[model samples]
Target chain A: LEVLFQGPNEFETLELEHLLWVNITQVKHSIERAWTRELKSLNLSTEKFAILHELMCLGGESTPHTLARRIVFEPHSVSAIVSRMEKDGLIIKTKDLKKHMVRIKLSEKAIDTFYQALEISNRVYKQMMASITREEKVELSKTLTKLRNHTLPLTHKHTKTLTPFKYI
Target chain B: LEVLFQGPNEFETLELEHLLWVNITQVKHSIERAWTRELKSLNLSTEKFAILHELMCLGGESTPHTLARRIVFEPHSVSAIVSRMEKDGLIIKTKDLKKHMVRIKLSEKAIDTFYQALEISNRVYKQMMASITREEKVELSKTLTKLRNHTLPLTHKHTKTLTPFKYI
Candidate 1:
């Protein structure tokens, strides 16, 4: 790996980036694994949970396009999820006659399980943040935000060519 | 959201947690998107690139299970990836009859594109770390490592009941 670098600083930067990426990936994977298990017991998919979160945050309604953008997923993927959720009675999609837009809202069934569904998510948060100081967390958030801000714009420009590959 | 919290400090913590999660998810998503674009242009999948990195880091060969574990992917997913890469001539899987394990190695095709593949990844890292100082990068890695350490063990305990879910 050192052979690939031109100098020490470059090596250090890349090394840290790799380390951060691995740790982030592992943590993200682990959390998802845990959440999937918990959510599955309740017969919910992660996408469904994300939908619930978005809907709840938006006060129970949003357009299909808005939901897809908020969740950073392609419209096709969100469309598939929406169809499934609607079939399962966890959500309903209604057409606005005047605007010709799709408005989606959580069904009574989904809203009923909303707070309870967040149990594992809340637990994971508490566990992950246990040892870290508040200041450290603030720093972490800022660092991640900086990274995201810098790279996110790059992704948007490449979206036509980079339509979310199948496997992570 | 504030109404759900019991007190101000609790609200602060949760707010920070939400911000951190959003930023981390965005950063992770963007990086993967960028990497996917780069790797795809080179005819490689993200999982395949991950396998290459693991194989390279391990000095050229590793067992299937080890690779899956290191990449935080289900064995089945890794198995599928390995099969495809093998079929594509990007990797070779050799049987260890004595140990009854399958060892994976990069084929000449994968090796030939290794450095060039890394160029885009390196470029992304440099772009992400651009204005951030080395000290901040170190701090980000440390915070993420702390979070990973805390939740990684929890995930193992849930592994029997939990399977990896698809999507970011």
Candidate 2:
């Protein structure tokens, strides 16, 4: 690692956190860059692939709102993708008139491609973790979870100001 | 954490990789969530602040293309934002008439709020790292760097497919 910090001193903690932010972003973007290629060849975007993955994980049926929440996207954005996917026969949407909810299910087409997406995902992840030992991976996960949990509440704290742009 | 993997099993490696992906996305989104609120209240977006941060990091004078690279945004997107910032009087753009390269400089107005943005950024970073130890933070950075370096070439592997959407 590139000695992000020399030693603990004034603003070292903040610097460390900044480094963490930048590094995670780099890693995330790298994965997306690779995954985007894998998806594009199959006529899918990252958002579409993410939706398919979520559906597979959720037994291939979930409400649009729930899918949006799980994927950290706005319901409107999710709705639009769901509509597009439905048109493309990659997924089907059913409306619960009573609850006014739109339930999403991956089509057989999506299921077939799901494995391909999974393969790409696995390849990217495997490549990412190739240099790190298993133990370090566990530690990394724990630290990231703590950071995510700690920071999640902060996001909620500003809901009033961020609700409109929450998708970002 | 939370037993991301029970033990090394058939799919443990894939599971571990998926966990890393989820955790990193969570952390990434959380940071954006909190940072968005801070920037939004000041009538700024994350993209705008990122440009400002890059300029400040480079001592506030850089070509628009260079700014786009540092912030991992597309040249077109950065160009648009730079134009918007120029219109808002938050920055100034000068063109090298010969080479047609655009150089950016933060206006006094932007410089005035630069410290405020820095303060909010530092505060958020400090809060995010409050629960982690210094060593753990260092470890996180190192692990993330490994993941980023390992996966970066994979992105390059499919550059043609992802170049347009590299910012995402």
Candidate 3:
């Protein structure tokens, strides 16, 4: 951490928000990298893992729009993954009386995929959080929820010029 | 937040680690979307901002590999960004007596870019974190640091078949 803010003394200022953002990104990437490795053998990506997790949490069915919002992905991107999964017999989609809007359900085969993915995620999370105490975990969830609740609306504020290419 | 884990009752278990990961990722994406919007006019991306930050913090010069590791980007991806920045005259690269390993320095032109980008990031962070208290901020920093430090090495543990396609 010091290494990041150590050089260029004149510009050496540390804002908590900025530092926390970097820290958060770092933590997120590391955890995902580890999780991705575990999910690889099952021919799963984190994107699919996210969709599966949400679908499972959402009673095994959800609309694409709802799924995209929940997983924080572009609707088109979600559609692409959904299309592939549907073709692979992992999920089923039905008409929703609109162009490209469809209700999606995890196929029975996907139920197994979802659980296996969950196991990998759980193991990775457990190993990665080996050092964090229970109290720290509780505090982190509350703090992040507060942050997410606050920031979620802000993402839609600058819609006109907002070139948000979040996850490619 | 409850919306994410609310739909499925039998699967309605919350591992603090899993819940926290989702929370952290959601928070991270929203913050970045806001930050990216602000950075748009300045012709800066978070990737470049990160490179500039590391160079600034490392006293205005660093090797690409070190920059990649610190910024948590793949070495090749870092190279591509550095190439563009170098061509745009925002940064300079010099040989380091090896293949593609060069010492990177932020050019004089980029000093202003770094400052302007910092200002936008500062404002974004300030706005996104408006609801968080002083105590919560500190707690977040400490906790994320602990998670990052613990999980950083785990990313390398399964390198053989590691299909870690993290970001776009």
Candidate 4:
């Protein structure tokens, strides 16, 4: 059935059943559930909230390519989400200086709603992390920062090449 | 429009767009895209893969409660995904060691298939982390570890509560 013992298992005998994978899944699920609940009052899905937040934080406008990179979704996915946001009056589309690209700009209405949403997100995350310590909080932030920076294998292998990212 | 500025744009001045948030979003998107591609090739979605993976890892059987926690999915959602796996011959539903509870036992067939899936998952992760340095990996692991220990607040004033979690 192509279902059994097809390849060599490469992990140590950690004895709890893909324990590492389980932990990762749990953490991510918790994040989604927490965020989902918090955003409900605002009619904000996580992806939608991220878009509005990005446009607001941008303080003006950004090209779609920039939005693709900076926003929470993929470029293609971001475009779709933006289309919906535009319809909702949360954002507006504008032309880049070159007139070759479309940019997403937050509206005054969205700016106000976004700030309210932030408070909800802030409260939810605080509760999610409430079980940990001050020193631990700082350390968690640091580790998450590292994990956030954790790189994966890529098509290109050059160590010296630079990717144009503003996240840095 | 109620969109007009209601007060000082204090948030505009603070500009809390952290590099950390951007990196987290990018890495997450990359993982989702890659997983989608790999799982798609196998006629498996990530959620299905997760159920099969859990059953295989637990030596082919576990209670729904355990699977729910273990899989990091909602208890309600687990039932639906499990129903599909059962129809596919990947697992079976049975009575649990405890009364009033149901459990899932993996099919011998699933064991063979899922072992291969794990190997693939490992490969995917290895590629993702390939660009990260050893020092950075350690730091990242450490940081995430901290975040998991306690629940961080939704705002600054609340406290985080610590709990036991296993990390590999």
TM-score for every candidate vs. truth? 0.79, 0.79, 0.81, 0.65
Judged by TM-score, which candidate is best? 3
Candidate 1 residue pairs in clash (backbone atoms < 3 Å): none
The single-chain TM-score for chain B of candidate 2 is: 0.75
Ranking by DockQ: 3, 2, 1, 4
Expressed as tens digits, the lDDT of each residue in A90-135 for candidate 2 is 9887887557777778888899987787787777667667799989
Q: Over the stretch B1-168, how does candidate 3's per-residue lDDT look in tens digits? A: 455643336454656787787777778878887788888887788888877876776677878766665567666878999898898898888888778767888888897888778877878888789899988998888898888778777765432221121111
Tens-digit lDDT track for model 3 on A90-166? Answer: 88988877787678999988999887777778778888898989888888888988887788777654322211211
Model 1 alpha-carbon miss at residue B143, Å: 0.7
Model 3 clash tally?
1
The fnat of each candidate, in order, is 0.47, 0.58, 0.71, 0.18
| Per-prediction DockQ | 0.32, 0.35, 0.43, 0.16
- Candidate 3 deviant stretches above 4 angstroms: A1-12, A83-89, A93-101, A157-168, B1-8, B94-101, B156-168
Shift in Å, residue B74, candidate 1 = 2.3
| DockQ value of candidate 2 | 0.35
In candidate 3 the C-alpha lDDT for residue B74 amounts to 66
- Residue B48 lDDT in candidate 4: 84
Ten-residue stretch with the least lDDT total in model 4 chain B: B154-163
| Angstrom error at residue A43, model 3 | 2.0
Rank order (by lDDT, best first): 3, 2, 1, 4
Give lDDT tens digits, candidate 4, residues B1-168. 566754323333321222233344545554655666775656667788777765554556777767665545566788888888888887788876568788788887777777677677767666555555556455555544444343223221222221133335
Tens digits of lDDT, candidate 4, A46-147: 788777766654564766776655444546777888889899898789777675777778888777888798787766665565555555555434544444
